[PDB]
């Protein structure tokens, strides 16, 4: 019977609290030759197979699924495609992480750095002996500094603008405070700042919508914790990748942290990231490490007589 | 492959109901010494809460998974016990987790269909596993305690629902000014919470006070004979057309005479799924009987690393 029913074989793990479906088998064949040929190909001949792993019931709106993929690049490890509930993604540094992760403890790699191949280009992640995985992230830097924006509700707040792979506002927050059991209060203030920020034109370079809001904080045993709102009204479990290397360019542009030294970013939920940079022109090469741990070896089973097979 | 038992594990198969998802534990948990199924869940919340968390806290859980631990059958009666579970703490009964339940184990081999008595812990729970794989429970008792009971929600003026039980307490409407589908819940779930505080505040509950924590809305539908929106405690909706919620409606129609009895009622969900129901009489009380179906999403090995400060859950 469960002989009878399509399967995905998918290994789940998580960065610092945010989880990565990791697909191993079970996929259509892609005959794309690129990686972005195949993310193509996916969207638009094969979807089912997305959704089925990332929308309700197998999925939530915290997960990113991975498709590994055989490398295409004559030195790269594998190729990966990632996705979310709501569509198809580039790149992912905590989805990387978990990649990397994965494939160690299949027996697939071992410690040292490692090319993966996106839809956008090469991504290189290095495997240390202790586990530990570093990200090299794109070119990151500040594009505006103390923005003043209303917020409904709540008052005027002033942050940075900032690019790490995606948009972020960056402010340092003194009102509300940085913890877990405080997570719906901070997700309602954090998603209608990003409203005001659309409502107020303020975005990123040339217009771009600025779809993350990152608040900061003092912590006793970090440099900084921080809370996290991203596109879907989700926070991020993790400290983020992309929003803390916003946050080394800021550091960087004021010289709060020297170059080669290391910033401890701590999340919502207790988990932790390092980071350290170097400077390029008037931007920095950021370097993000964090671990990924598993969570589960699992079959996701589809029913073809189920109207929610491929998800809800 | 040594590796991955390096980690402790929990076999595990998923399955939803309606939409309303149940993770049921095969294998992992601690060996339990309980005589029963409530000494079993005393023990489990008491000796061995960690192995919950792990299925059921973020990364491996969510806020609308219920978790279903098999057990071996202590009545002599059964063909197993079960504790259900979620995020918070432990259930007593759960329909559609049964339904899951009694799905997984035909699909595992453990049974066919016909009668199958479950002991959980709070005694019996009765299902029926018919020859086409729907399964049908019996709800605890309900009943209807006030009619037409008018409340005040700002916004919307006075509506007017009906207060019942099936298990929880519901205030029932029908309701013709908000649009019942899945693409307006955002809405629909702050009109039913402003609901639930406007009754609160005008005073207005089950039997003997008893507060009214859930709320359905109702409305015609092309292909059932009505179709929900059920807000359930934690600001949640049901993705199915709730069993204790439905059988909270059968009573409703049972009082108006809307239903015949042994008659089926069928109820849509807001996702679009569907439950069957019909009653019997119990003096002035029924006895709902719901069916549904569940289908399979996964057969999972739950992995624990221990370096893992999140390994027993967030």
Same mark, same amino acid.
């Given at each position: 019977?469960?002989?009878?029913?399509?399967?995905?074989?998918?290994?789940?793990?998580?960065?610092?609290?945010?989880?990565?479906?990791?697909?191993?088998?079970?996929?259509?064949?892609?005959?794309?030759?690129?990686?972005?040929?195949?993310?193509?190909?996916?969207?638009?001949?094969?979807?089912?197979?997305?959704?089925?792993?990332?929308?309700?019931?197998?999925?939530?709106?915290?997960?990113?699924?991975?498709?590994?993929?055989?490398?295409?690049?004559?030195?790269?490890?594998?190729?990966?495609?990632?996705?979310?509930?709501?569509?198809?993604?580039?790149?992912?540094?905590?989805?990387?992480?978990?990649?990397?992760?994965?494939?160690?403890?299949?027996?697939?790699?071992?410690?040292? #750095?490692?090319?993966?191949?996106?839809?956008?280009?090469?991504?290189?992640?290095?495997?240390?002996?202790?586990?530990?995985?570093?990200?090299?992230?794109?070119?990151?830097?500040?594009?505006?500094?103390?923005?003043?924006?209303? #917020?409904?509700?709540?008052?005027?707040?002033?942050?940075?603008?900032?690019?790490?792979?995606?948009?972020?506002?960056? #402010?340092?927050?003194?009102?509300?405070?940085?913890?877990?059991?405080?997570?719906?209060?901070?997700?309602?203030?954090?998603?209608?700042?990003?409203?005001?920020?659309?409502?107020?034109?303020?975005?990123?370079?040339?217009?771009?919508?600025?779809?993350? #809001?990152?608040?900061?904080?003092?912590?006793?045993?970090?440099?900084?914790?921080?809370?996290?709102?991203?596109?879907?009204?989700?926070?991020?479990?993790?400290?983020?990748?992309?929003?803390?290397?916003?946050?080394?360019?800021?550091?960087?542009?004021?010289?709060?942290?020297?170059?080669?030294?290391?910033?401890?970013?701590?999340?919502?939920?207790?988990?932790?990231?390092?980071?350290?940079?170097?400077?390029?022109?008037?931007?920095?090469?950021?370097?993000?490490?964090?671990?990924?741990?598993?969570?589960?070896?699992?079959?996701?089973?589809?029913?073809?007589?189920?109207?929610?097979?491929?998800?809800?």
């Amino acid at each position: 019977y469960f002989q009878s029913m399509k399967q995905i074989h998918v290994i789940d793990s998580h960065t610092g609290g945010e989880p990565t479906r990791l697909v191993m088998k079970g996929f259509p064949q892609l005959h794309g030759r690129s990686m972005a040929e195949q993310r193509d190909e996916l969207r638009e001949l094969h979807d089912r197979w997305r959704r089925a792993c990332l929308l309700e019931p197998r999925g939530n709106d915290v997960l990113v699924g991975a498709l590994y993929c055989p490398p295409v690049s004559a030195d790269a490890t594998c190729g990966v495609i990632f996705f979310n509930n709501a569509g198809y993604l580039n790149m992912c540094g905590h989805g990387t992480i978990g990649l990397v992760a994965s494939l160690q403890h299949l027996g697939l790699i071992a410690p040292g #750095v490692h090319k993966i191949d996106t839809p956008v280009g090469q991504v290189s992640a290095t495997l240390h002996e202790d586990g530990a995985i570093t990200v090299a992230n794109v070119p990151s830097y500040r594009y505006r500094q103390h923005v003043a924006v209303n #917020v409904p509700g709540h008052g005027v707040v002033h942050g940075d603008i900032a690019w790490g792979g995606n948009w972020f506002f960056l #402010v340092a927050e003194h009102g509300q405070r940085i913890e877990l059991d405080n997570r719906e209060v901070l997700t309602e203030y954090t998603w209608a700042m990003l409203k005001a920020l659309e409502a107020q034109g303020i975005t990123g370079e040339n217009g771009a919508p600025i779809d993350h #809001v990152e608040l900061f904080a003092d912590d006793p045993n970090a440099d900084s914790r921080n809370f996290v709102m991203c596109p879907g009204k989700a926070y991020d479990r993790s400290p983020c990748g992309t929003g803390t290397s916003a946050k080394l360019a800021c550091l960087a542009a004021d010289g709060t942290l020297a170059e080669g030294q290391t910033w401890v970013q701590a999340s919502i939920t207790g988990s932790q990231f390092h980071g350290r940079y170097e400077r390029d022109g008037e931007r920095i090469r950021p370097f993000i490490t964090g671990r990924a741990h598993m969570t589960a070896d699992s079959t996701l089973l589809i029913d073809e007589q189920d109207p929610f097979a491929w998800g809800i």
